[PDB]
Design a protein around this ligand. Structure first.
Ligand SMILES: O=c1ccn([C@H]2C[C@H](O)[C@@H](COP(=O)(O)CP(=O)(O)O)O2)c(=O)[nH]1
Ligand SMILES: O=c1ccn([C@H]2C[C@H](O)[C@@H](COP(=O)(O)CP(=O)(O)O)O2)c(=O)[nH]1
Ligand SMILES: O=c1ccn([C@H]2C[C@H](O)[C@@H](COP(=O)(O)CP(=O)(O)O)O2)c(=O)[nH]1
Lengths: 137, 137, 137
């Protein structure tokens, strides 16, 4: 399925100097998120920093969620992943999307303004209601 | 979609001193899981410990699964994540839900009884059957 | 739901000495991926290595994706996880499936040929189109 999602641009560079997230191909599962920074940030081995995106989304449909994931190349080659490992975005969240960037490797890394630093997928979710039982089938 | 899921309470504190997992809002994607412990557990930097939840679920429908994820604040601010990174819960699993808690940071952390230590989402899954071919389209 | 997925065997050991991935039970969410290696690989604490699977898939339907995850036992007990944490497989990717294996613990680990080293789930995905607004509801 396809879905239109309302988005608010919070920093006027988003959609200009810092491109809006896009799907690379018709068959891509995820879109790439970019670092909305004024200057580069040096991240030493072991350290975590919070990177803004300059945007907010409103998924609004409670049957849908988004998940933020590391990029494959950054993660495998540079040890640049997420501090919370995976970021879960609720359908009712309307704040700025923030990225927890963590250096899990041994080499210092320069995070540049505008760099694709994470990816984000939209997946269907189910809200569970618990039915208390003494035994299962 | 919404789904009723059978759950068995294994420790009589679950639903009393240790609240049952709940969705914070109507639009939340995940519910928070709590540590079912008799006493606090100190987790040093680099170490992993297995934390019980005091409950079992039976999803039962093979078109559904659950995934356990770190909490955002614990992960980003405290370096408190999962040892297996993401925990996959099969539709036919009927054992106690166990949480692999890992300190990926530099500061020792006290895991308290009743603390929300992870989150869990229910997602649709597809069972694949492989069709062997010499070439793709 | 169930789905047939085209797969190409790239190494003639896959389906013979190295079994093809299978679901353990009718209710399993994921299938296990095996290391397609000529000889064992020793992975020291902190290090990452790229392990081939000897196969390619073509999901082809843009409403579906796959995610590669650590195994629970390897991750919790041995500190053997993924360097990119979670691996996202696009519906239009036709290359060999590669696994980023990372030792996040303190003990050296021997990766053997044919060993189940990761798992893979197929999940529905939604392609988002962004609708720019001044304010949300
Ligand atoms: O990586 C993330 C994760 C969550 N978020 C947003 C989206 C979520 O819906 C919202 C969750 O906030 P909570 O207060 O529920 C996180 P907690 O402090 O409980 O760990 O934060 C991000 O911007 N980046
Ligand atoms: O974090 C987790 C992950 C799995 N589990 C449960 C739910 C799964 O369906 C079940 C999987 O057990 P396996 O024996 O398949 C894990 P393996 O030893 O193969 O790595 O364990 C947890 O309680 N916590
Ligand atoms: O763990 C992984 C992740 C991706 N892949 C494949 C499947 C993806 O569709 C493809 C993505 O390649 P990209 O060039 O988009 C990754 P990037 O270099 O942008 O980080 O790589 C793997 O084989 N293993």
């Amino acid at each position: 399925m396809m879905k239109k999602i309302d988005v608010k641009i919070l920093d006027p560079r988003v959609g200009k100097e810092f491109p809006l997230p896009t799907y690379a191909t018709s068959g891509s599962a995820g879109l790439d998120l970019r670092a909305c920074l004024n200057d580069a940030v040096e991240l030493a081995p072991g350290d975590t920093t919070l990177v803004p995106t300059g945007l907010a989304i409103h998924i609004a449909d409670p049957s849908l969620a988004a998940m933020m994931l590391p990029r494959s190349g950054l993660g495998h080659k540079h040890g640049i992943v997420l501090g919370n490992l995976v970021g879960l975005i609720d359908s009712d969240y309307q704040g700025q999307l923030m990225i927890s960037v963590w250096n899990r490797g041994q080499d210092s890394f320069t995070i540049q303004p505008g760099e694709r630093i994470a990816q984000m997928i939209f997946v269907p979710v189910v809200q569970a209601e618990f039915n208390l039982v003494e035994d299962f089938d």
